Design a protein around this ligand. Structure first.
Ligand SMILES: CC(C)(C)C=C=C(Cc1cccc(C#N)c1)C(N)=O
Lengths: 124, 133
């Protein structure tokens, strides 16, 4: 069983959508991805709920209450073989000095959530 | 009328299980009955990938490890999360119109899903697969 560690992120309160997703994609991802490779993460996914996606969402879910949408700005996901990869990555000195502090730039940790699931995946 | 280039999309369904249903019957139903019912429709409409996330007896002790010192409220406690990766929302809209989809897979949800306590999401995704290829 592969595991998936997901963090549902609400963006910084004084932060625009454009600044938030610019940061996540263009500054945080290149800073983050080296460590995920180092610790043998299988896949890193970033889900974006922004101006590009929101109209297609509205199209998909029109006529339901808006409350029916899980409305985080970004969802961060890594598929790992075990949680030791994550635990070990968390103890990494550079990860702690550079990428962990980076969350000051985009994530409101008081309005974000995490979830560790095990997955079944089917690729067509 | 000229469109910005397409980005991969992820349609996520966040499912709370039927209240009168144990976790074990929830995930067995999801793995063993729904997923095979569902999958042929995902192929038929060119779905790129189908992921089922389980939050259950197997995953929870590891989730508790990762979230040491964090309140229960910080946990997204849906029982299962369904993700289909598609290249355009047209795949999904049209799959949603399929008569057998509506006849079998949609109503199967009365066997595992509390839809009043379920949510949906349509995002665009960036993805990095680390496998050397
Ligand atoms: C919560 C969110 C989305 C910011 C995760 C992230 C990181 C790095 C980071 C920072 C703080 C704690 C952990 C752990 N475990 C990991 C990133 N996006 O670089």
């Amino acid at each position: 069983r592969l595991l998936c560690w997901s963090i549902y992120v609400t963006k910084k309160p004084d932060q625009s959508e454009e600044d938030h997703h610019n940061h996540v994609s263009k500054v945080n991802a290149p800073m983050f991805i080296p460590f995920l490779k180092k610790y043998g993460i299988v896949r890193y996914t970033v889900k974006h709920n922004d101006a590009y996606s929101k109209p297609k969402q509205a199209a998909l879910m029109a006529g339901q209450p808006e409350e029916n949408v899980l409305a985080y700005d970004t969802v961060f996901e890594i598929i790992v073989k075990d949680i030791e990869s994550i635990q070990t990555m968390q103890k990494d000195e550079e990860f702690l000095r550079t990428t962990i502090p980076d969350h000051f730039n985009f994530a409101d940790m008081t309005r974000s959530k995490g979830s560790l699931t095990w997955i079944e995946e089917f690729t067509f």
